[PDB]
C-alpha cells in the first residue's frame, strides 16, 4: 500500500533530487536520491517516493528522459504528485 500526496517546489532550480525508473525501464518513476537540505527534501519528499505526476502530466506515460525534460522545462514552480510506501511491520 502507498500514501499519495502533493508538493510544489518554488524555483529556481536546482530542486535537489535524482530520478530512477520510467516506462522504458518497466517500473514507476521514483526519487532515487535527495540533496540534504535541498528544496525537495525541505518539502518532505523521501527517497523511494514514486512520482505520479509532474506539472499535471501523468508520470506513468513518461520515459525516464521525458520526465527529466518535464522537470527541466518546468519554469518557476515544480508540482509533484507523489506516493510513499506504507511499510507496515
From Swiss-Prot:
It is found in: Cytoplasm; Cytoplasm, Cytoskeleton. Residues 2-85 form the PDZ domain. Transmembrane segments: none annotated. Isoform 1 and isoform 2 are expressed ubiquitously, however, isoform 2 predominates in skeletal muscle, isoform 1 is more abundant in lung, spleen, leukocytes and fetal liver. The modification Phosphoserine is found at residue 79. The LIM zinc-binding 2 (LIM 2) domain interacts with TBX4. Binds via its LIM zinc-binding 3 domain (LIM 3) to endocytic codes of INSR, but not with those of IGF1R, LDLR, TFRC, or EGFR. Interacts with various PKC isoforms through the LIM zinc-binding domains. Binds to RET in a phosphorylation-independent manner via its LIM zinc-binding domain 2 (LIM 2). Probably part of a complex with SHC and the RET dimer. Interacts with TPM2. Interacts with TBX4 and TBX5. May function as a scaffold on which the coordinated assembly of proteins can occur. May play a role as an adapter that, via its PDZ domain, localizes LIM-binding proteins to actin filaments of both skeletal muscle and nonmuscle tissues. Involved in both of the two fundamental mechanisms of bone formation, direct bone formation (e.g. embryonic flat bones mandible and cranium), and endochondral bone formation (e.g. embryonic long bone development). Plays a role during fracture repair. Involved in BMP6 signaling pathway. This is PDZ and LIM domain protein 7. It comes from Homo sapiens (Human). The lineage of its organism: Eukaryota, Metazoa, Chordata, Craniata, Vertebrata. The gene is PDLIM7.
Amino acid at each position: 500500500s502507498m500514501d499519495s500526496f502533493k508538493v510544489v517546489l518554488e524555483g529556481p532550480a536546482p530542486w535537489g533530487f535524482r530520478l530512477q525508473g520510467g516506462k522504458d525501464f518497466n517500473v514507476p518513476l521514483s526519487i532515487s536520491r535527495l540533496t540534504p537540505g535541498g528544496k525537495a527534501a525541505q518539502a518532505g519528499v523521501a527517497v523511494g517516493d514514486w512520482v505520479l505526476s509532474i506539472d499535471g502530466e501523468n508520470a506513468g506515460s513518461l520515459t525516464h528522459i521525458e520526465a527529466q525534460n518535464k522537470i527541466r522545462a518546468c519554469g518557476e514552480r515544480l508540482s509533484l504528485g507523489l506516493s510513499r510506501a506504507i511499510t507496515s511491520l
